[PDB]
């Protein structure tokens, strides 16, 4: 009745955060403060995302992907927010948020932030 | 004229392998032998993939995702192969391979093995 990997929800979430930091690096940020105790707060991360395959150093379209993973993630959808949108209209931001929440529902059962991030990168490329 | 991350192709490929090992763990395998010299062969990995959100311990449909990344990856598509297919017909395996190579073409410019792996997991769930 448990996931085939045999890992708990915190281990699956912690492994995804390590994977996100390895690929995105400085564009990834764990917004949780350094806890002096043994309790780990639910992960809240920020991903600065650019159009797919962006080159150079001059950006025109970008947005920050704010993801808060509840304890039952990824068996439940995470809290998705879009911040610091640049070069996007209000209708395009609402559309992207609706598509991400729709993607998150179909992605339940597996960690999904990598798929949400690529969906944003592909979306930004279509509006660039 | 270079990627916005400022990282080279080997660094982007090595970061993806570290991310893949963190999430998939034992289902991920680097098929490159341990080189005693300083030259790193092109990454050739194997991903044992199951239907999305598979529970229990009894598997019915599964396949291994064989990916070989050329030096210019991800600016060029990687070599994709499907091995050890279980519960899938020959037509379904050829379809999955065609969809993965189509996905890889649209994903050029960013690392894509995570998107290829989820596409397989979602595909296996539709044939389960």
């Amino acid at each position: 009745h448990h996931h085939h990997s045999g890992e708990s929800y915190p281990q699956r979430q912690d492994h995804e955060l390590q994977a996100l930091e390895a690929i995105y690096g400085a564009d990834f940020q764990d917004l949780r403060p350094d806890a002096c105790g043994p309790v780990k707060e639910p992960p809240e991360i920020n991903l600065v995302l650019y159009p797919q395959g962006l080159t150079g150093e001059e950006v025109y379209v970008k947005v920050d992907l704010r993801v808060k993973c509840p304890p039952t993630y990824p068996d439940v959808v995470p809290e998705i927010e879009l911040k610091n949108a640049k070069g996007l209209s209000n209708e395009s931001v609402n559309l992207l948020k609706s598509r991400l929440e729709e993607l998150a529902k179909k992605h339940c059962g597996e960690v999904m932030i990598f798929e949400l991030a690529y969906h944003v990168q592909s979306f930004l490329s279509e509006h660039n």
Side-chain angles (χ1 to χ4, degrees), chain A residues 61-67 69-78 80 82 84-85 87-104 107-117:
Chain A
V61 172
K62 57 133 294 186
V63 76
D64 292 3
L65 180 56
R66 193 67 57 90
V67 177
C69 300
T72 324
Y73 171 90
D75 274 348
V76 297
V77 293
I80 300 173
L82 291 172
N84 301 318
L88 295 170
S89 60
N90 290 343
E91 284 78 25
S92 295
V93 176
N94 299 335
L95 206 237
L96 180 54
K97 185 172 182 177
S98 299
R99 286 160 57 126
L100 289 173
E101 291 177 320
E102 171 176 272
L103 199 149
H107 204 312
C108 275
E110 307 284 340
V111 285
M112 66 196 71
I113 305 193
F114 276 112
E115 278 68 60
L116 296 170

Side-chain angles (χ1 to χ4, degrees), chain A residues 3-13 15-20 22-28 30-39 42-43 45-46:
Chain A
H3 196 249
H4 70 89
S5 67
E7 319 178 302
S8 69
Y9 290 108
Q11 191 174 341
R12 293 171 74 187
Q13 291 176 13
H15 285 357
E16 186 179 36
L17 299 190
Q18 300 169 18
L20 286 168
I23 285 189
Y24 287 101
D27 294 326
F28 168 81
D30 196 341
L31 300 189
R32 292 174 304 180
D34 189 12
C36 60
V39 175
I45 62 112
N46 185 83

